[PDB]
Design an enzyme around this catalytic site. Structure first.
Site, PDB file in Angstrom:
ATOM      1  N   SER B  29       0.817  -1.202   0.000  1.00 24.45           N
ATOM      2  CA  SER B  29       0.000   0.000   0.000  1.00 24.45           C
ATOM      3  C   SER B  29       0.859   1.263   0.000  1.00 24.45           C
ATOM      4  CB  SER B  29      -0.903   0.011   1.229  1.00 24.45           C
ATOM      5  OG  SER B  29      -0.159   0.052   2.442  1.00 24.45           O
ATOM      6  N   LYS B  66       0.862   4.452   7.067  1.00 25.01           N
ATOM      7  CA  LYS B  66       0.278   5.329   6.047  1.00 25.01           C
ATOM      8  C   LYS B  66       0.852   6.728   6.168  1.00 25.01           C
ATOM      9  CE  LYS B  66      -2.947   2.535   4.215  1.00 25.01           C
ATOM     10  NZ  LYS B  66      -1.920   1.465   4.255  1.00 25.01           N
TER      11      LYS B  66
END
Lengths: 108, 108, 108, 108
Positions: B29, B66
C-alpha cells in the site's frame, strides 16, 4: 518486570563490522533496483560477489555501483532502462570492493 | 599512524534511541513511497507527527503504515494508486505511534 | 430526593486515561484466554508488564497479542492449543507496547 | 654473448601486488601535487596511511583523492589553492582505502 531491549542497528544489519562501510549512491542508474541518488549503501567487503549481487566496483580506474553479471559473460549492468550495460573484456580491468547488503532511504 | 573509526549505524540514523524502534512493513500500500513488503521501518515516537509524515497508526484498533494528511481533512492515505484513502471522522479513533524516519531495504 | 449517577465507563474501567488505547483482537490464538476475533482490547501502556500479563508486543517488527512468560525463559505464548509459543532469544527483539487490562465482547 | 633483461614495471613499481590497484584521477584538486585529470594513480592498500600521504578516501560515502593531515587535526586537504580543506569531525566518517605510491602521466 519487563526490560526494554534498546534498538541496535549494527547488530540487526551488520554481519562483519570490521569490513562493513557505507557508500552514498549517485545518479539514477540503479533506480529500478531501489537505489536512488543520495541513499546510503551499506557495503560488506568480507563477502565474495556473486552473479546478481549489487557491487561497488572500479572499471578502468572509475568507481560505480552496478549489478554484477558473470553469466553468460562478465558485465556490469544498471537497473534503469535508459542506461546501457558495461562488458568486462580482457583489455578492461574489473575490481570489486564489496557487496551492497542494504540500502538506507531517508524520509524526514 | 592513522586509526579507522568503525561504522555506527545508531549514531548515523537514530536521534532518540530511547524511543526508536523498528516495524516491518506489510503489503504494498506504500510502494510509490519506497516502502515495500518486508522492509524495516525505523520509527521515532519522540517526534510529533505532521502533515505529510509517514506514520505507524491504529485506526479503530487496527494498525497500518500510512501517510498522515491533516489538511484539508484528517486522513491516512496510501502511496499506491490501487489503494484508497482513509478518512478519520468523529466516530473513528486515530492513534499515531510514531513517525517513520528511515526505510531499510535489503539487497541480500 | 434521589439523583441518578449516570454510568461512566472511563472512570470504571480506565486508570491512566492519557496512556490507555484500544486494539482490536485478531484471529483466535487467544481464545482460551477469552479473547476472540473482533473483540476490543483496552490497553494500558503506563503499567509495566509482568509474568502472566497479556501484552501487545512486536517480535522482530511484527505485532501480536500474547501472554508474556518471563520464567523460566522469556516467551510469548498463545492461549489456543493449536498455536505454538514464541521464544525471545538474543537474536530476536521483543517490544512491549502495553498490558491488556480488559476485553470488551460485543453481543448485539 | 649478452642477453637483454626485458623491462618489468610490476617489479619496479609495485611492492604488494596482491593489494595494489589503479584509480584514475578526477578533476584538478591535486594539480600542485602533480596529479592531473586523467592520470593513473597506483594505490597500495597494504600500507597504513600517515600524515602527508596522498590517499584514496571516502568522506560520508563520497570518494576523493586527497592529502591526509592528522596533525593538528584530521583533515583531507587538496593541492590546489582554489580548493578548500575538509575537516573530519566526529559527525563525519573517514575511510581510507589505500595510499597513492605513484602517478602515471601519459604523454601520448
Amino acid at each position: 518486570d519487563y526490560v526494554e531491549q534498546r534498538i541496535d542497528l549494527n547488530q540487526l544489519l551488520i554481519q562483519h563490522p570490521s569490513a562493513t562501510y557505507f557508500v552514498k549512491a549517485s545518479g539514477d542508474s540503479m533506480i529500478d533496483g531501489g537505489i536512488s541518488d543520495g541513499d546510503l549503501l551499506i557495503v560488506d567487503s568480507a563477502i565474495t560477489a556473486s552473479h546478481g549481487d549489487i557491487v561497488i566496483a572500479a572499471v578502468d580506474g572509475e568507481f560505480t555501483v552496478k549489478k554484477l553479471q558473470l553469466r553468460p559473460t562478465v558485465q556490469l549492468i544498471p537497473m534503469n532502462s535508459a542506461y546501457s550495460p558495461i562488458t568486462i573484456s580482457s583489455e578492461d580491468t574489473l575490481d570489486v570492493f564489496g557487496v551492497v547488503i542494504h540500502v538506507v532511504k531517508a524520509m524526514r
